[PDB]
Amino acid sequence: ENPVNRLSRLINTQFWNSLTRRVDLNNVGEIAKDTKIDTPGAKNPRIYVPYDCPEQYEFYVQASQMHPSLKLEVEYLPKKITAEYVKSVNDTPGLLALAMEEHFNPSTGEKTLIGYPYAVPGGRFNELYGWDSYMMALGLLEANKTDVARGMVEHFIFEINHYGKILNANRSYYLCRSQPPFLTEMALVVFKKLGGRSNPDAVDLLKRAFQASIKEYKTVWTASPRLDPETGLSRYHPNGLGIPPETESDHFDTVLLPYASKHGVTLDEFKQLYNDGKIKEPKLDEFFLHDRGVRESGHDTTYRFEGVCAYLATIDLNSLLYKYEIDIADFIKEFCDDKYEDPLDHSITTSAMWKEMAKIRQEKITKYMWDDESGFFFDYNTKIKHRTSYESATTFWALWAGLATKEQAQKMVEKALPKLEMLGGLAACTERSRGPISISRPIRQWDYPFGWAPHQILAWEGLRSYGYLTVTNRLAYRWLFMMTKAFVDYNGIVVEKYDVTATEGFGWVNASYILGLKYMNSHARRALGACIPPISFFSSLRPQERNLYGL
Known about the structure:
3-stranded antiparallel beta sheet, Cytosolic neutral trehalase, calcium, calcium ion binding, cytoplasm
């Protein structure tokens, strides 16, 4: 049996199941156990429920009573979840409620609640994460595990409605932070799979997911502080107070120690004083704004974002919002007779207005970000008004999104791609841009020489979209080879991160393997199975087949 098949098989059956979760009356305790925070208030597990969800409140109370052994506390959240409140529950952390489906005893008619199912990114975790869940949904759909993927769409709808945004993960201490947005596409691909228009259930889901997406776009991404009104582009600029509690106790000690010493106190004491707004240190308040912004960017961390992130209008975010605008334009044209009225503010929009927003975004991005010379869309700093020159694998999100001109795609493929394409796929950024590594300045995980699943997946699809499928094959081969070599040599371990230079795997890594194979014919599968590295494999082909890999 061929290792590419053993791994395919394992991912598609056993790993997704090992990675499935579903909240019922008996496990709520297990799932809510949190160790990331250690205070008296954290010793007991806890679940926070929104203010307008009484059945759900009843449910988790019932759960707490059926297993008093656990000491499961259950609080209601405020209708208005402010940053100050969120800080106020740092010492009493909790799991957040998520979507729940209704079952009914078909002869008695008694109502029951059971969690819509989801997947976690690794065997270690129990929470629903954000962007990881779109990639996993793609993977799950291929395994005909559509219900788990749909559950996640169900959950993101719920999160946007009750917590105001899609969350990094469904815990009290993440309430002020989001993730890169993929709801429109996530909802479209689950919808194609359940049947499309011919499925009343699917159309209802599509609608709920687009009401939500429009609310997310208007209230989170093009709003508040995250919008830079000058450019019209958006930043990862979450609200939030004080020190993120969930982190390693000592995580921030080296940056904090000088401040504590400037103020004549110990570190413990300085923490407290900061976290009660009693320090007036501007450049420390800024540093935590960027740290929050990093965590919201999903790229934790990289030198692209260290000490800048929340002033950057990223190609990352602004590509994804382009996608939002296009997808919403179609949705309104096709399922709202071309007039959508937002029920929350009675604002009335047409597909043409949405397309126009997209059009404008495209010009705005091109203007501030595009560099015809190198072939990269660079992030734009919005505080100092100046372009970046960090060469990121996220430049491909512009193909994925569909916002790049054909001339732009050519230039990126010809001149940018070679600076990112390493032995095992796309590195998250180039060697040049990472800079020199030292003990002062150590290796960050989302930089060269590392390559990440999501970056591959988005690029594969982006290039396929602009007619570069032949390049996707080459890139896929490189990634799949490297994953397959690892699996063989490390005695069955699938790994979190790869340098392109356990029993569960990892969500988007697993999904990357299955998505990658769809591009690979029999021959390529056999060579991958024989652990033949790309240079050798390509070199063995007749030049007609070598053209399938654009070589």
